[PDB]
Amino acid sequence: GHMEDIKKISIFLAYNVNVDAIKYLKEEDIQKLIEEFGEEEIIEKIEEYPRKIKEPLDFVARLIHAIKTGKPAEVPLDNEELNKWFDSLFKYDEERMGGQVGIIANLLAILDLKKVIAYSPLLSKKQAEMFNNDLLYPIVENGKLVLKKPIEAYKDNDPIKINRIFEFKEGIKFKLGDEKIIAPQANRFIVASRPENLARIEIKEDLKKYLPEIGEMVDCAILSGYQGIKEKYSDGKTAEYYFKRAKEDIKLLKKKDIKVHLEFASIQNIKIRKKVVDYILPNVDSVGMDETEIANILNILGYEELSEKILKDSKIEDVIEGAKILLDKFNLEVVQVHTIYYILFISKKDNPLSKEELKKTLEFATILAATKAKLGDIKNIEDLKVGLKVPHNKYGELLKEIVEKLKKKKKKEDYKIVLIPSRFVENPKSTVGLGDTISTGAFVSYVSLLKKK
Numbered sequence: 001g002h003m004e005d006i007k008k009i010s011i012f013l014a015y016n017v018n019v020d021a022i023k024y025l026k027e028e029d030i031q032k033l034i035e036e037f038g039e040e041e042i043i044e045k046i047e048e049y050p051r052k053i054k055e056p057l058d059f060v061a062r063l064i065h066a067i068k069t070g071k072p073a074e075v076p077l078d079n080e081e082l083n084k085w086f087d088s089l090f091k092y093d094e095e096r097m098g099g100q101v102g103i104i105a106n107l108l109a110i111l112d113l114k115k116v117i118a119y120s121p122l123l124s125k126k127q128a129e130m131f132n133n134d135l136l137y138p139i140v141e142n143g144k145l146v147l148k149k150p151i152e153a154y155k156d157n158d159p160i161k162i163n164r165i166f167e168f169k170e171g172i173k174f175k176l177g178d179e180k181i182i183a184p185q186a187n188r189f190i191v192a193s194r195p196e197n198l199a200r201i202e203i204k205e206d207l208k209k210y211l212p213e214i215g216e217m218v219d220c221a222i223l224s225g226y227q228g229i230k231e232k233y234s235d236g237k238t239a240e241y242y243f244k245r246a247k248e249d250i251k252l253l254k255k256k257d258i259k260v261h262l263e264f265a266s267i268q269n270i271k272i273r274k275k276v277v278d279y280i281l282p283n284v285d286s287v288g289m290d291e292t293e294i295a296n297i298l299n300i301l302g303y304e305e306l307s308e309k310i311l312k313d314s315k316i317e318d319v320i321e322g323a324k325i326l327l328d329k330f331n332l333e334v335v336q337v338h339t340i341y342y343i344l345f346i347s348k349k350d351n352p353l354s355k356e357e358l359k360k361t362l363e364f365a366t367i368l369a370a371t372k373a374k375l376g377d378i379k380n381i382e383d384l385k386v387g388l389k390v391p392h393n394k395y396g397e398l399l400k401e402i403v404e405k406l407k408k409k410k411k412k413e414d415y416k417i418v419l420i421p422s423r424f425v426e427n428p429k430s431t432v433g434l435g436d437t438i439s440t441g442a443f444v445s446y447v448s449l450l451k452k453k
């Protein structure tokens with residue numbers, strides 16, 4: 001319980017919240033779709049490969065197409081006027097809080113943090129009910145900034161962003177025409193739209209003036225959702241407009257002294273990914289990422305040779321070298337890299353924390369990650385004891401010894417490098433958003449130990 005000095009942490013979170021409505025597909029389900037829509041019409045439609053869903057058949061064909069590959073896919077609805085028709089035709093099994101803000105803010109509430117301020121542009125009644133009741137939502141009433149609970153700041157008439165997810169296990173089998181189909185791998189087919197018509201990824205004009213005020217009452221922030229920003233919008237606005245104003249929010253928050261953290265998401269649009277590199281990464285204090293994304297960042301900065309060595313081979317010496325480049329280039333205090341086997345932490349030599357403390361930050365991150373992996377969602381702090389029963393990966397212990405040897409050889413260590421093995425869960429319940437869980441655990445723990453000093 002001593003580690004839980006974190007409960008003394010207050011934190012601000014923006015920008016992405018949504019509702020996840022999940023269907024857990026079984027063979028019978030796909031069978032009913034085949035019967036109700038027909039085999040030839042689906043087969044013909046799969047050849048068509050619609051890029052957006054306009055008629056119910058589009059969804060049937062793209063869902064089956066994806067199931068054939070075992071690879072992930074996202075197709076938006078053609079128009080938000082089809083939402084309620086879609087939800088009555090293809091009903092969900094369960095509804096849930098989605099989005100990096102909504103998921104992590106709810107977890108930080110369950111971890112009893114001092115103050116957790118979460119912000120999203122849309123706050124419909126159904127959405128606001130998904131929040132943990134301890135969360136605070138910023139509001140400007142009567143020329144003053146007021147933190148109120150979400151079930152008391154919601155607005156009727158507000159739309160609701162919903163991600164429709166269809167989960168299919170490995171090996172789900174069904175016939176289509178003569179083609180017998182087997183799921184090569186477990187994957188999820190997602191029906192969802194990036195915001196344009198209904199909302200945008202930004203702090204509204206009214207709240208902007210109060211960002212520095214939010215900066216005073218908060219020890220740290222975690223910002224996310226930049227993968228939802230579009231290159232061009234119909235109203236003539238562009239990614240640059242929103243990325244510029246996203247840069248402004250970080251700068252307004254940092255008039256006062258806070259740490260800002262970013263978890264580097266897997267943005268498949270390279271032009272929007274390059275925007276995150278240019279507008280967000282240089283202005284932030286902490287970053288977390290996997291092996292794939294550091295190579296993707298190194299490739300944007302021009303280290304093409306290094307990027308492929310990490311991608312092809314994954315040697316820890318190369319990941320450490322790539323993390324050192326990120327640390328020195330961008331005004332960062334720390335860089336975090338996570339893989340199924342290890343978590344790596346690097347900070348300049350003048351970091352107020354000791355190598356001993358940095359390892360404690362990491363230890364707590366592996367426990368929290370292992371709790372969620374074995375239990376699915378975390379619902380209580382008691383659950384962290386389940387993660388403590390998960391032992392360290394044996395190959396990571398080997399990498400720890402390797403890093404220790406590396407450090408002894410070099411003449412000057414102007415850096416603090418700490419690696420611990422992960423608490424791998426072999427037959428995990430869930431794997432989604434595990435990266436945000438680990439990265440948040442280490443960052444919050446890191447902010448704690450800084451605050452004690």
Ligand SMILES: Nc1ncnc2c1ncn2[C@@H]1O[C@H](COP(=O)(O)O)[C@@H](O)[C@H]1O
Pocket residue numbers: 289290338339340341369370373422423424425426427428431432433434435436438
């Ligand atoms: N079975 C598992 N047990 C513990 N952690 C896992 C497991 N599978 C995946 N992870 C973590 O999930 C992360 C994936 O993060 P990302 O794909 O960036 O969201 C990896 O870096 C691992 O640390």
